[PDB]
Amino acid sequence: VAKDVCTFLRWAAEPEHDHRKRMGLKMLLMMGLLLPLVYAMKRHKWSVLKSRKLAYRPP
Amino acid sequence: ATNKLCQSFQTFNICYADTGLLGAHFVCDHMSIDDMMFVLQGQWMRLCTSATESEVLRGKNLLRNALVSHLDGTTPVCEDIGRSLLTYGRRIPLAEWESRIAEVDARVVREVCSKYFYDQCPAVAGFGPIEQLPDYNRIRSGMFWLRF
């Protein structure tokens, strides 16, 4: 009786609970996809600079 | 000329055996390098995407005139013989050059330029007060348009 009423009072206080968590999963997955992709795009553009070598050639 | 971007420039197309260098060289004020690059790369893109019949006709006519008047007197003709036999394996007669030139229309210039210029990684060399000379990424992004 206590377990059930608590579960209801949880839903009372936070109806969004189930939707919230559905969105959480979809966020975690998209971020799982986009973060390493955007990170790869970053390293790609920056690779011109990461590779570069300098030389000082006074006369 | 009107904006005094550069002191000089030329397009080239250097040929070697299985490869070459196709582009341009310019000499300019230290404040003009970015603008020169922009207009030059802009031209490459315009020819790739949208070259007109009349301007290609002009280019044809320039080239016809170029190689007919370069071969004047014995030294340039001797050299043309010497080197053509090495590079092509034969001298290509002026009548054959003309046939290849007449074959080129606006459609050809587009398709040919797009092969070598459009969305391709260039080689850049800069010397002197080159603080303005665009970053490679900016140069490389300047090798395409977001429209065509």
Swiss-Prot record, chain A:
Residues 51-59 are mitochondrial matrix. The chain crosses the membrane at residues 17-50. Component of the ubiquinol-cytochrome c oxidoreductase, a multisubunit transmembrane complex that is part of the mitochondrial electron transport chain which drives oxidative phosphorylation. It comes from the Eukaryota. Signal peptide: none annotated. Belongs to the cytochrome c family. Component of the ubiquinol-cytochrome c oxidoreductase (cytochrome b-c1 complex, complex III, CIII), a multisubunit enzyme composed of 11 subunits. The complex is composed of 3 respiratory subunits cytochrome b, cytochrome c1 and Rieske protein UQCRFS1, 2 core protein subunits UQCRC1/QCR1 and UQCRC2/QCR2, and 6 low-molecular weight protein subunits UQCRH/QCR6, UQCRB/QCR7, UQCRQ/QCR8, UQCR10/QCR9, UQCR11/QCR10 and subunit 9, the cleavage product of Rieske protein UQCRFS1. This is Cytochrome c1, heme protein, mitochondrial. The chain holds residues 266 to 324 of 325 of the full protein. It is found in: Mitochondrion inner membrane.
Swiss-Prot record, chain B:
It is found in: Mitochondrion inner membrane. This is Cytochrome b-c1 complex subunit 1, mitochondrial. Belongs to the peptidase M16 family. UQCRC1/QCR1 subfamily. It comes from Bos taurus (Bovine). Transmembrane segments: none annotated. The chain holds residues 333 to 480 of 480 of the full protein. It comes from the Eukaryota. Component of the ubiquinol-cytochrome c oxidoreductase, a multisubunit transmembrane complex that is part of the mitochondrial electron transport chain which drives oxidative phosphorylation. Component of the ubiquinol-cytochrome c oxidoreductase (cytochrome b-c1 complex, complex III, CIII), a multisubunit enzyme composed of 11 subunits. The complex is composed of 3 respiratory subunits cytochrome b, cytochrome c1 and Rieske protein UQCRFS1, 2 core protein subunits UQCRC1/QCR1 and UQCRC2/QCR2, and 6 low-molecular weight protein subunits UQCRH/QCR6, UQCRB/QCR7, UQCRQ/QCR8, UQCR10/QCR9, UQCR11/QCR10 and subunit 9, the cleavage product of Rieske protein UQCRFS1.
